[PDB]
Amino acid sequence: GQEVETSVTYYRLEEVAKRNSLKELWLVIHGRVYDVTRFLNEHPGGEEVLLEQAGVDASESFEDVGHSSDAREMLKQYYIGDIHPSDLKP
Amino acid sequence: KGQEVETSVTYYRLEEVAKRNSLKELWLVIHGRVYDVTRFLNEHPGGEEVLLEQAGVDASESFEDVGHSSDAREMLKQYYIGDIHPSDLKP
Numbered sequence A: 001g002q003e004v005e006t007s008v009t010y011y012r013l014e015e016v017a018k019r020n021s022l023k024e025l026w027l028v029i030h031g032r033v034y035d036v037t038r039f040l041n042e043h044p045g046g047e048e049v050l051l052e053q054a055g056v057d058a059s060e061s062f063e064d065v066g067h068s069s070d071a072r073e074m075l076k077q078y079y080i081g082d083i084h085p086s087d088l089k090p
Numbered sequence B: 001k002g003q004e005v006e007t008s009v010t011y012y013r014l015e016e017v018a019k020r021n022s023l024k025e026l027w028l029v030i031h032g033r034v035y036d037v038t039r040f041l042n043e044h045p046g047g048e049e050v051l052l053e054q055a056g057v058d059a060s061e062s063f064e065d066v067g068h069s070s071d072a073r074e075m076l077k078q079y080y081i082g083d084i085h086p087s088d089l090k091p
């Protein structure tokens, strides 16, 4: 009856996919979930390039843009949890 | 013979971009990046002239005002050739 200790909060992709609009947008980048709602209208690349990646892996999109170190550091403020292990590639 | 610094990406100066302003060779600047669209002119659904009209200048607002689809934005990546030189960016 020993129990695994919990640490990070996991979200399944099907739950992430429900926050898919200007009301509330979560994005998945490198295995982590970011609630970027508050940043949508500040994002230099605009809202639409973020919105269109709802519910899918946004990592390739994010990396192809060539985001600066400053942009990468801004990521952490929007962190809310990790994608559930069952939704990752092995 | 001395130390030199290197950049991550390939840069093109706006002066080099502005020379490719025709059907023979057309480059565009969209969101700080340079695209060689010569081979796409003929197939572009919005026609050739709206692309040719943006030679030599920043085409970002024109591209954004059209409301291009996600497919069109992914397609834009196929034409990427480099980033605009840092010295050509507005403050």
Ligand code: HEM
Pocket (backbone or CB within 6 Å): A027, A029, A034, A036, A043, A044, A045, A046, A049, A050, A053, A058, A061, A062, A065, A066, A067, A068, A069, A070, A071, A072, A074, A075, B031, B032
């Ligand atoms: C999710 C957290 C994100 C943050 C904090 C973020 C942050 C930033 C920042 C600060 C810039 C300014 C340039 C730089 O510093 O590199 C930028 C530019 C940009 N971002 Fe993001 N970004 C995020 C996600 C994304 C995603 C997912 C996409 C693509 C689907 C995207 C596409 C772009 C584009 C296209 C630009 C260039 C804008 C231009 O100059 O017109 N970003 N981003």
Ligand code: HEM
Pocket (backbone or CB within 6 Å): B028, B035, B037, B040, B044, B045, B046, B047, B050, B051, B054, B059, B062, B063, B066, B067, B068, B069, B070, B071, B072, B073, B075, B076, B079
């Ligand atoms: C290499 C960069 C470009 C690509 C890949 C591209 C791609 C496309 C595609 C695929 C479409 C069909 C509709 C859609 O899927 O959104 C389209 C339509 C259109 N494009 Fe572009 N385009 C580019 C640059 C531009 C630029 C710079 C302009 C403006 C000067 C422009 C103006 C238009 C117009 C007017 C339409 C048709 C009207 C529409 O349905 O909104 N495009 N473009």
Ligand SMILES: [Mg+2]
Pocket (backbone or CB within 6 Å): B021, B022, B052, B053, B055
């Ligand atoms: Mg001309």
